Amino acid sequence: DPAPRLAGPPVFGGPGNDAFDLAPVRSTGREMLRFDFPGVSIGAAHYEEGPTGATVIHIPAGARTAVDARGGAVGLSGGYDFNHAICLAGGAGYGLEAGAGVSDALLERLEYRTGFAELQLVSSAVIYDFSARSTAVYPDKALGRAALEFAVPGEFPQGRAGAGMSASAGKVDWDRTEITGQGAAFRRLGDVRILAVVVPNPVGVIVDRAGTVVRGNYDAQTGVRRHPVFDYQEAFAEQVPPVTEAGAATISAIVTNVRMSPVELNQFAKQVHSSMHRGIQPFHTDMDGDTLFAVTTDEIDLPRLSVNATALGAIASEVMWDAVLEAGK
Amino acid sequence: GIAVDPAPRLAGPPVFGGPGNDAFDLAPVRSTGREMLRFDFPGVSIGAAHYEEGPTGATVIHIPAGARTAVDARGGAVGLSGGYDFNHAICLAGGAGYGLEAGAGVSDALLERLEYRTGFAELQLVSSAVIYDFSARSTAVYPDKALGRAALEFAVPGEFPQGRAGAGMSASAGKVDWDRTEITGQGAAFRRLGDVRILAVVVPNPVGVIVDRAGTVVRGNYDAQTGVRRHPVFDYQEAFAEQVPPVTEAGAATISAIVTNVRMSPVELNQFAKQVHSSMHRGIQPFHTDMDGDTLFAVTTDEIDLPRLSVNATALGAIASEVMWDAVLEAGK
Ligand code: NA
Ligand code: NA
Ligand code: NA
């Protein structure tokens, strides 16, 4: 095990946002991760009517960011090299609207100042979560605003919370797809802080450090999860078309306090994002919209090629794997 | 054959401390601009809406079939949402990053039109790009969901409102010194050659100036003390010669689309996009600077085949480059 969480087949023709007086709910998930990271707040809100949600990482001072987008199905807004917030949401491309709610709320907080240096920058990424439920409800401006309003320092709701409400893994065949969640992990090493946040909605499965498939591609007929490569290789061996459902992505953030140059931060982002092919397999496929944000608060100076980015990247890769395993738990 | 008005239209300094959207009962206005371009391209509609209280607006290109797209983004200040390789609409808007919300209004309206079908193949894909237009007016009003929805609702086949209309309402050029910045507009141009159709749409909000085919600066960097415009390079070279810091204001971009009916592979379409986008350094100078958020969408409706390197993309790119220069001059007229 763990116990199966099959998504089950969606019921088509379900209601959308116009059918409801949508009430934002503060997401608490299955448990709260507590950590110490001054200047970073996290909020998560959902609509039970979906169920679908949004998770917002708010860094009020603004933070330098690198964006690494992979796959054929990325859903991204802004992708800025400097952000006051990162907004992760369900609802496919429709859920990018949640980031507009964050942006608008930040503008209002700044008393509608619009000097170029005062622009409030929100980058948003989405997962397609419509197959995992029987409604067309999407995260909207009101839900992004709610997630920001619910944001507090040093807390993250694990599991079915915010953007993770209806995330799912293992999409060779929808009959074997399982609900994941969102996950976070945190490490402090001296003054160095690393926070990983992930919403895995992959076509692939979640894999632990022993190589065990722990979430996704669960066959009710056998009681066992299978690495998708075994399904693909048997399709090719039998000379029949392989199958896989569209509507997949993993959207993620690494937040650190270590000062990194733009080149270091971008190389760091690419290394950490590639590392996730250990815990999610396959990963970075044409079916996926994989988007990682690497964010630094530029607080700590560590003592032409960067050993510091490489070493920090290796550690952050482990924090991110732990976050993926929390999402699949 | 575009007769650009020599008369200055300096933006002037803003009055700031201006209020935001909810301070107003905002009614979308259908933008008519100074003149309507009429063109024959079935399957392509354009809508333009503005708020007088900005003034600011959005321009939406609606292609209900969906169309293969290449995005070419240059500079350090791009404001882009979606950037999809297949789009049902392109939304160009003011309001800097806040104006990307207009595209959410278009997306939501299209989802409602599809009766909330959400199959992956049924997703309604809208790519949005923005200009910073807050220095050209006082209010913090931005294109919002309602304005994007209005622009989509106002979309008319085969028409485009030239000038101060939609996203072009508060576009401006020539930002070495804001005292010399002039209002531009939005512009479009269209050519048919045999069965080939090319539509260019542009919203030039550049740090640079608009330049005609004779090399004359026709919009931006107008010095009211001398009654003439000149190329920004004169300002930059004088700064370096005097050993003082150069100056240039932030908040600049040119956002554009080239729509054609010629079938092109993804590789051809991306190469075509890069060629046409680079070509715009002829009509906008400087261009593709770190101060700019330049974003071009190259869209094909994949209707006609022309009879490893693409002569067709190169030839079509050369002609589209001229259509785009005409569109830039319509914006500056
Ligand atoms: Na200001
Ligand atoms: Na459907
Ligand atoms: Na077509």
UniProtKB/Swiss-Prot annotation, chain A:
Gene3D superfamilies: L-amino peptidase D-ALA esterase/amidase. The active site is at A249 (nucleophile). CDD domains: DmpA_OAT. It catalyses: [N-(6-aminohexanoyl)]n + H2O = [N-(6-aminohexanoyl)]n-x + [N-(6-aminohexanoyl)]x. GO terms for biological process: nylon catabolic process. It holds the Pfam family Peptidase_S58. Its EC number is 3.5.1.117. Optimum pH is 6.5-7.5. Pathway: Xenobiotic degradation; nylon-6 oligomer degradation. Expressed as an inactive precursor that is cleaved autocatalytically at Asn266/Thr267 to generate an active enzyme composed of an alpha subunit and a beta subunit. It comes from the Bacteria. Keywords: Hydrolase, Nylon degradation, Plasmid. It comes from Paenarthrobacter ureafaciens. The keyword Hydrolase applies. Changing D104L: Increases thermostability by 13 degrees Celsius. Involved in the degradation of nylon-6 oligomers. Degrades cyclic and linear oligomers of 6-aminohexanoate (Ahx) with a degree of polymerization greater than three by an endo-type mode. Cannot use Ahx cyclic dimer or the Ahx linear dimer. SUPFAM superfamilies: DmpA/ArgJ-like (SSF56266). This is 6-aminohexanoate-oligomer endohydrolase. It is an enzyme of class 3 (hydrolase). GO terms for molecular function: aminopeptidase activity. Belongs to the peptidase S58 family. PANTHER family: BLR5678 PROTEIN, D-AMINOPEPTIDASE. Heterotetramer composed of 4 alpha/beta heterodimers. Exists at the monomer/dimer/trimer equilibrium in aqueous solution.
UniProtKB/Swiss-Prot annotation, chain B:
Its EC number is 3.5.1.117. The keyword Methyltransferase does not apply. InterPro entries: ArgJ-like_dom_sf, Peptidase_S58_DmpA. The active site is at A253. Pathway: Xenobiotic degradation; nylon-6 oligomer degradation. It is an enzyme of class 3 (hydrolase). One of its GO terms (molecular function) is aminopeptidase activity. Keywords: Hydrolase, Nylon degradation, Plasmid. GO terms for biological process: nylon catabolic process. Expressed as an inactive precursor that is cleaved autocatalytically at Asn266/Thr267 to generate an active enzyme composed of an alpha subunit and a beta subunit. SUPFAM superfamilies: DmpA/ArgJ-like (SSF56266). Optimum pH is 6.5-7.5. It catalyses: [N-(6-aminohexanoyl)]n + H2O = [N-(6-aminohexanoyl)]n-x + [N-(6-aminohexanoyl)]x. The keyword Isomerase does not apply. Gene3D superfamilies: L-amino peptidase D-ALA esterase/amidase. Heterotetramer composed of 4 alpha/beta heterodimers. Exists at the monomer/dimer/trimer equilibrium in aqueous solution. Belongs to the peptidase S58 family. This is 6-aminohexanoate-oligomer endohydrolase. The gene is nylC.
